């Protein structure tokens, strides 16, 4: 019953909702009490989305309970099909709806809508938003994706990018550029650029590229078994990881490793005499395990930083995080509580912190350089400009974003000394 002031992840119904709005033509009716519409404006505000999210809440009140709740669910799904006209439907329940004896699948099946309907079961109190998104994507793949014939040219599927994600759009663009330079053609991108037709085309790709394991591991493994599609275990964040990803993708496809590193500037700008002071700086890393692992690798190898703290808020990723932290000689801070992170920061005192929005604000109160590298972000952290976190230009973006706070601190300190 521990009181929570800040939550790193939301309820799984939010995570599954990050899949519906990414997909085009997929509307999902979710049983929620009247007032759970707050999560709808996350995409309209934080992600600045013109489209209304494909969510049709039942919005049951205290007046309507018992059979009336089922009546509201039935009518909501009927209206969603009748007017919203989705190409596919998936059904879920919020925490309050889960608590009552509500069966999402039964009413939707009784409606017998011609469009496919995907029933999601999510334990709202045990799991969190990332599991909701992952398991929702898994259910959509299982319901729609079939083992269709392979394509003529080499085709890859970009699994993992979901809505309300950190740099997902620009990272999609960068990885698409790398794959096109390789010679591979992206058969489909899910769930960000996906459609119910596109998921049916997941069986067409020769291999799957798993950009974000949090939202795409389970789809990747299910495609590995049922669809006989092998997926890449490496995430291309930073120059070294980008080269490793290029090698892995070339090995999987059989294509030649043509990576345009002309765009690359992070190695040379790091090797310059300017970035000498960057050597030995202490960095604390928190956020999603993939981002933190990649950022720690980048900071230690390419940026010349000493990885001083490492942790993730994905308890589902405890083992890779622990293994990576043992790689740099640390213990992984796998915690979902911001207070443990704050105590680690105070007792540890890093020079620079890279992490979530909570991470950045903790640093601001502690008065030490802060940058954002993880999924929990503000509206301002969603950029209109082209700011990938992956690929060779993503390396330049990472270098600039990480060195910007240190440069501000150095310039301000020098000015204050001079005055």
């Amino acid at each position: 019953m521990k009181l929570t002031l800040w939550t790193y992840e939301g309820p799984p119904h939010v995570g599954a909702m990050r899949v519906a709005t990414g997909m085009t033509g997929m509307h999902y009716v979710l049983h929620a009490p009247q007032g759970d519409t707050y999560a709808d404006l996350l995409f309209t505000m934080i992600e600045r989305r013109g489209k209304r999210p494909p969510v049709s809440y039942t919005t049951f009140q205290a007046r309507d309970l018992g059979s009336d709740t089922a009546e509201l669910f039935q009518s909501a799904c009927r209206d969603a099909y009748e007017r919203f006209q989705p190409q596919a439907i998936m059904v879920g329940s919020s925490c309050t709806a889960e608590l009552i004896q509500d069966d999402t699948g039964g009413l939707a099946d009784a409606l017998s809508l011609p469009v496919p309907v995907v029933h999601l079961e999510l334990p709202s109190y045990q799991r969190k938003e990332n599991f909701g998104a992952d398991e929702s994507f898994l259910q959509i793949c299982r319901k729609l994706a079939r083992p269709m014939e392979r394509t003529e040219k080499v085709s890859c599927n970009l699994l993992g990018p979901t809505a309300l994600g950190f740099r997902h759009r620009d990272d999609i663009l960068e990885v698409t550029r790398l794959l096109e330079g390789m010679g591979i053609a992206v058969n489909a991108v899910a769930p960000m650029g996906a459609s119910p037709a596109d998921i049916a085309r997941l069986g067409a790709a020769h291999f799957n590229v798993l950009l974000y394991p949090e939202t795409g591991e389970s789809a990747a493994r299910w495609a590995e078994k049922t669809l006989k599609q092998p997926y890449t275990k490496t995430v291309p964040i930073g120059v070294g990881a980008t080269r490793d990803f290029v090698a892995e993708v070339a090995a999987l496809a059989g294509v030649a490793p043509v990576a345009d590193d002309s765009r690359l500037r992070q190695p040379w700008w790091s090797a310059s005499v300017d970035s000498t002071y960057l050597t030995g700086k202490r960095v604390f890393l928190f956020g999603d395990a993939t981002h933190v692992i990649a950022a720690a690798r980048v900071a230690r190898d390419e940026m010349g930083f000493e990885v001083v703290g490492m942790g993730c808020y994905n308890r589902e990723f405890a083992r890779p995080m622990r293994a990576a932290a043992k790689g740099y000689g640390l213990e992984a801070l796998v915690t979902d509580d911001y207070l443990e992170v704050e105590e680690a920061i105070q007792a540890l005192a890093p020079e620079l912190i890279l992490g979530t929005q909570m991470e950045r604000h903790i640093a601001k109160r502690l008065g030490i350089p802060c940058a954002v590298i993880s999924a929990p972000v503000h509206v301002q952290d969603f950029p209109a400009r082209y700011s990938p976190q992956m690929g060779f230009e993503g390396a330049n973006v990472l270098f600039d974003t990480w060195i910007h706070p240190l440069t501000m601190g150095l310039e301000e300190h020098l000015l204050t000394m001079f005055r």
Partner: protein, 402 residues
Amino acid sequence: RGQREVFCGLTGIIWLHRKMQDAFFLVVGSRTCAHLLQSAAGVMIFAEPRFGTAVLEEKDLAGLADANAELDREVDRLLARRPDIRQLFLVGSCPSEVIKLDLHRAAERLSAHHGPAVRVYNFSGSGIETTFTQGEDACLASIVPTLPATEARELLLVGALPDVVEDQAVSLLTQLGIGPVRCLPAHHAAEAPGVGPNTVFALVQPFLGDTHGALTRRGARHIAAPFPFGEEGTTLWLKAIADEFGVSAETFEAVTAAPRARARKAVAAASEGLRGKSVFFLPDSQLEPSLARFLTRECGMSAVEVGTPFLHRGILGPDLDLLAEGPVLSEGQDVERQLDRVRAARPDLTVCGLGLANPLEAEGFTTKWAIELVFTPVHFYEQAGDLAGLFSRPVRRRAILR
């Protein structure tokens, strides 16, 4: 009847705890309500707020006595962190109501536990029962049945108001000269005022209906007046206060002449962009009747429709009499049908819910979002010009951009 886009009542906490510095709002809710508070509060979350939510686990939902024990232990840990807090607010939430956890009995137990200093009032802001600004009055409607009685005929400003607006209202009422003012929301429990049949209460915000009932049971009788939105509404508010207290007409006019002129020039300056325009009101904040009236007469705008999540005719009476016969008054919400209606009407400006604000901009309709009016000082004379500017700004930006 259908889907309703409006926030569940815990969102009223986010601006309540700014008024009440000795009050901690301990929400008893699931992960979803914690996420609501964290998201809505946004930047607040990083500045040690006074609201915290005790998440219910599967071991918590089972049983009630164990849930009560865990809630009590959580309250003790929190009081260890914050001994300064003396009026805690256990807040019922949707899963808390489904658990049927007794907030009343918990209030009694915790009040007995810390009788002398820390006294705890519990209200409900669950979405099944309470919506948006109904979160605020429900909080105040829980304190009222427990405030001490008094035997002095006094005026009290019922409703949460910003400190600047509160001091301005107090200054205006003292300029009237008759009647002492004791604002109902006490920023500190030690500063708690007294309410009884002697007192008379003048409403300052339209969503306060449960407080209306609580004060009716207290014995005070309402004085109906237009609500302070714009120069003219605040003018009639002060006029009704003066009539209630027998303050002479000439003294009230002399007191209000200059500030009324300032408010008039302020609204006139901002209404120019809005002159000869149309407005659509989507029901979110319950502020919509008074806002529509102020825009209709002071700002010279035409209202297609005024929508209300809950229409209290008793208190909104005078503001409805001032409001023209033109617009259609809607009670409740059907977001799909309302969206179709606003698409059909093509209003120049649409005061709509925040979840619908950006999509309506994408469709090409200029939008204003009432939650800023909930926080921003838009009440009374001086802030009336700012209130006009809030609606003027979206249309002005639409004109500048294209």
